[PDB]
Design a protein around this ligand. Structure first.
Ligand SMILES: CCCCCCc1nc(N)nc(N)c1-c1ccccc1
Length: 186
């Protein structure tokens, strides 16, 4: 199994969802960036794993579920089988990471991408080890009811650039945004 990563799009007031919907209007190139980054795997014969909480899974429009070309794993203690269209179910992020070393997935998974939501990000971000955060900064305030956890910059370094990630300001539908990559190893 390869690197562990979080990927998020977040407004200036730290919002990531409004009743699960994006707080901002849909941004086509931001969507394309998310698909490209989470799907691209260099290791021949493997796919990336996407891990998400139950609410994040059901916030994805059905036409976009499962995230194609990736192994889709949902976290839930209430669910007793993977949701329709998903591939795997784990009770916790720890169990999901443990599963990636079981024979059922050990040689199948390259990169692991945590795609939401708030509590899953928080657990990943505060667990020791090597972790990167791919953060799209939506540079406006938007009404939200779920939020990204604080990034502790004592441990997460903002990288000066990263291959395959544009470094300059983007704009869609009149909304400026930018792509950042953070890395910790503790
Ligand atoms: C259905 C795919 C939406 C992709 C655009 C939104 C998005 N952007 C970034 N950079 N990270 C994320 N985790 C998400 C996201 C992915 C799934 C659900 C909610 C937000």
């Amino acid at each position: 199994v390869g690197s562990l990563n979080c990927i998020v799009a977040v407004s200036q007031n730290m919002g990531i969802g409004k009743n699960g919907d994006l707080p901002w209007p849909p941004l086509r190139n931001e969507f394309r960036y998310f698909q490209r980054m989470t799907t691209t795997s260099s290791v021949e014969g493997k796919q990336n794993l996407v891990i998400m909480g139950k609410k994040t899974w059901f916030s994805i429009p059905e036409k976009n579920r499962p995230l194609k070309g990736r192994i889709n794993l949902v976290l839930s203690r209430e669910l007793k089988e993977p949701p329709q269209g998903a591939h795997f179910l784990s009770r916790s992020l720890d169990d999901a990471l443990k599963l990636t070393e079981q024979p059922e997935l050990a040689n199948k998974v390259d990169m692991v991408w945590i795609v939401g939501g708030s509590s899953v990000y928080k657990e990943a971000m505060n667990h020791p080890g090597h972790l990167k955060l791919f953060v799209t900064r939506i540079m406006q305030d938007f009404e939200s009811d779920t939020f990204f956890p604080e990034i502790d910059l004592e441990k997460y370094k903002l990288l000066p650039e990263y291959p395959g990630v544009l470094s300059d300001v983007q704009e869609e539908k009149g909304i400026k945004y930018k792509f950042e990559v953070y890395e910790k190893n503790d």
